[PDB]
Amino acid sequence: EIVLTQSPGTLSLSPGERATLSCRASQSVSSSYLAWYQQKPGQAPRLLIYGASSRATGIPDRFSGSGSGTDFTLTISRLEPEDFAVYYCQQYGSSPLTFGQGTKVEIKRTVAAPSVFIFPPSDKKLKSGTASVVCLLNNFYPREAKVQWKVDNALQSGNSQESVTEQDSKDSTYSLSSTLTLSKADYEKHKVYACEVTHQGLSSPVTKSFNRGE
């Protein structure tokens, strides 16, 4: 099985800038049978390049493909707002046909620190036998953000889930929800619940905390 590794995972850029996307194969790709696709949310993928360097019909000149063997590149010479999407490489020379894991080209904007909010479990939620503690990080950029849960100052691991929104269409920021999940009985054994947030926009980590029952 030919493994295709796409790099970087995310390319943060602005319109007018050049995008360089890489695709590296674990073994040499048979007769440059390499394709590039673009995919927008809620749409099927669209062929951009086939045979490593041939532009598909209807594809703008700004898109160009190159490389051979183990190393391929997709170049977008001058980004247009419609080019912010997910890009995949695929080899079709030998079975199993494989896709790369994708590269997202995201809208670059200025750094914005998150606004941090904490939500203690409601009585209605506790009545269900579960304590969900929610920490909200709102309108931040870049996407990289660290959330640390602390219960009576002990660092938490393996008992939380994170969800992130897609980049906002108007301000290009992200929002993230981190939920600490404990059983009601376990939640009642501890007093101090804290969410510690680390981000480029913050000069030092921001903590939001509460005491159970207050």
Binding site: A56, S95, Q101, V134
Partner: protein
């Protein structure tokens, strides 16, 4: 004009069977190899199976080998994918794709493999308080849980409140049920003056919930 129209998708249980079909038009069908490509919700493209123009050669990803069968009826311009012994991990949008370097794709057909039965959500308010007040802004929300299948729609004040609303993607839980949250930031001065209600609609179960989000001290 080249057209690929998928059908046969829907809700199915693990261990169950489903047959997807793709009706092709606008080209000599038998002259092209055809593939099935799937995409799990929020994930990347995964190649599933390919078949030559004649149907004499079939190819499968290791993850579907022995369970799925690709076939074609060249006298009917139809591509098929017989999916047996279905697993929760087979949940995805399934695309019909033409050729080698897929120049045409169908719109896709959603397949949801789950042992869960259709169920409406439980709604829990995320009340605003001093703990969710950043400066002169307060955050409030609603946790929407234990529902199946996707989607739920969440609106605030019957659609009158749209500014600063963030509805998070659903997360599949071990129960086979989904959960999400919807939040909104508002002026902290509006609390106790402006009423905030999250309206949760779950069409598959014919259920709708309103939850008035009340400020705390």
């Amino acid at each position: 004009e080249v057209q690929l129209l998928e059908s046969g998708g829907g809700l199915v249980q693990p261990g169950g069977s489903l047959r997807l079909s793709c009706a092709a038009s606008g080209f000599t069908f038998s002259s092209y190899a055809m593939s099935w490509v799937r995409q799990a919700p929020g994930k990347g493209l995964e190649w599933v199976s390919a078949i030559s123009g004649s149907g004499g050669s079939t190819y499968y990803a290791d993850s579907v080998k022995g369970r799925f069968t690709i076939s074609r009826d060249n006298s009917k311009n139809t591509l098929y994918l017989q999916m047996n012994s279905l697993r929760a991990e087979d949940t995805a949008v399934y695309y019909c794709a033409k050729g080698s370097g897929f120049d045409y794709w169908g719109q896709g057909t959603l397949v949801t493999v789950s042992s869960a039965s259709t169920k409406g959500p439980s709604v829990f308010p995320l009340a605003p308080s001093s703990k969710s007040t950043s400066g002169g802004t307060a955050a409030l929300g609603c946790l929407v849980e234990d529902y199946f299948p996707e989607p739920v729609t969440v609106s605030w004040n019957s659609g009158a409140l749209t500014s600063g609303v963030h509805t998070f993607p659903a997360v599949l839980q071990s129960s086979g049920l989904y959960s999400l949250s919807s939040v909104v930031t508002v002026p902290s001065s509006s609390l106790g003056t402006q009423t905030y209600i999250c309206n949760v609609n779950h069409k598959p179960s014919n259920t709708k919930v309103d939850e008035k989000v009340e400020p705390k001290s």
